[PDB]
């Protein structure tokens, strides 16, 4: 194809730029296929994600375009970024395929979970997580679906976040990975249907940090009813001021619950699971967990405050924390509608950009 070349990836074809060689499958939808590749120009490994049937239906087309627009609002090192987007077709008439090039990491948090870890590597990872999360929130993007499989890391302890504002899925994480369900890490206000805000991802991070320490999922609910039980059996029944905010019927069910008493955070996370001067850290860490793993969103720690926390504060770098997003996501897009062909163009222009 003059500037492109075909390569057979399973039952699928990848027509990519010549600069990308040694293509090989590492994940698979459903909604797309991801290949690890070598970028000759950059001398650097990349992840090439080919969207599957972005023009199949009006819904797919909206997702394809929306995904492009989302990664436009982001310019942070702790978040996955679009290294390149392209199509092997020459005109809008025959345009049908879209390819997304992203940085290729070595791992996701799941493979970190089982590792022993110390305070400097743990607190650093969390710091990056909070840095990437703040950037998203600044761009007007609240993740909500933060889980160890959509958080990727490299061997040099660098961290990036995947799948912000994507359905599950839809996104990149579902198609590959040691996969994990999002149910375990969703905040109370989400699962209880109360609506949410920025610090909904603070809960998520809380669940992730708890798993890093205990090397086991904190709230493995068989379903959302069981999920709620797991949460309250360990953290206790939330104050009345919280429950009054619930919807009528659900409020009663949750008020119908057996009043469980919360285990103390030193009990949930005994120093046994922790590692001397570096025992002040175990205090610092456990404390932080008591602010993130809060049921009431009003009584939960903010992203900003979490950055200021002694266990995290050691890493504070204003360049890493205050880096503004290139653009803010206009939510008035979600309610916009177009035909498949109209969507096809908006996407096409974005690619040729």
């Amino acid at each position: 194809d003059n500037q492109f070349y075909s390569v057979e990836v399973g039952d699928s074809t990848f027509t990519v730029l010549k600069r990308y060689q040694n293509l090989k499958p590492i994940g698979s939808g459903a909604q797309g296929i991801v290949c690890a590749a070598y970028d000759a120009v950059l001398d650097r490994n990349v992840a090439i994600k080919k969207l599957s049937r972005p023009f199949q239906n009006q819904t797919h087309a909206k997702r394809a375009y929306r995904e492009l627009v989302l990664m436009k609002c982001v310019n942070h090192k702790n978040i996955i970024s679009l290294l390149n987007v392209f199509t092997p077709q020459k005109t809008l008439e025959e345009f049908q395929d879209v390819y997304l090039v992203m940085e290729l990491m070595d791992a996701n948090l799941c493979q970190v979970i089982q590792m022993e870890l110390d305070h400097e590597r743990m607190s650093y990872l969390l710091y990056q997580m909070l840095c990437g999360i703040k950037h998203l929130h600044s761009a007007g993007i609240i993740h909500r679906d933060l889980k160890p499989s959509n958080i990727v890391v490299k061997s040099d302890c660098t961290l990036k976040i995947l799948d912000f504002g994507l359905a599950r899925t839809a996104g990149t994480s579902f198609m590959m990975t040691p996969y994990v369900v999002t149910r375990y890490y969703r905040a109370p206000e989400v699962i209880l249907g109360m609506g949410y805000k920025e610090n909904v991802d603070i809960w998520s991070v809380g669940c992730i940090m708890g798993e890093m320490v205990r090397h086991k999922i904190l709230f493995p609910g068989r379903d959302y009813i069981d999920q709620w039980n797991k949460v309250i059996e360990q953290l206790g029944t939330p104050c009345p001021e919280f429950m009054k905010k619930l919807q009528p019927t659900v409020r009663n069910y949750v008020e119908n619950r057996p009043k469980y008493a919360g285990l103390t955070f030193p009990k949930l996370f005994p120093d046994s699971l922790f590692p001397e001067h570096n025992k002040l850290k175990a205090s610092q860490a456990r404390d932080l967990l008591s602010k993130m793993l809060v049921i009431d969103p009003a009584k939960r720690i903010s992203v900003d405050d979490a950055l200021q926390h002694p266990y995290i504060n050691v890493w504070y770098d204003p360049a890493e924390v205050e880096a503004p997003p290139p653009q803010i996501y206009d939510k008035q897009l979600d309610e916009r509608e177009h035909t498949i062909e109209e969507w096809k163009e908006l996407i096409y222009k974005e690619v040729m950009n």
Partner: peptide, 8 residues
């Protein structure tokens, strides 16, 4: 420091 590692 910032020059930490982690192995898989």
């Amino acid at each position: 420091k910032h020059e930490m590692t982690l192995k898989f």
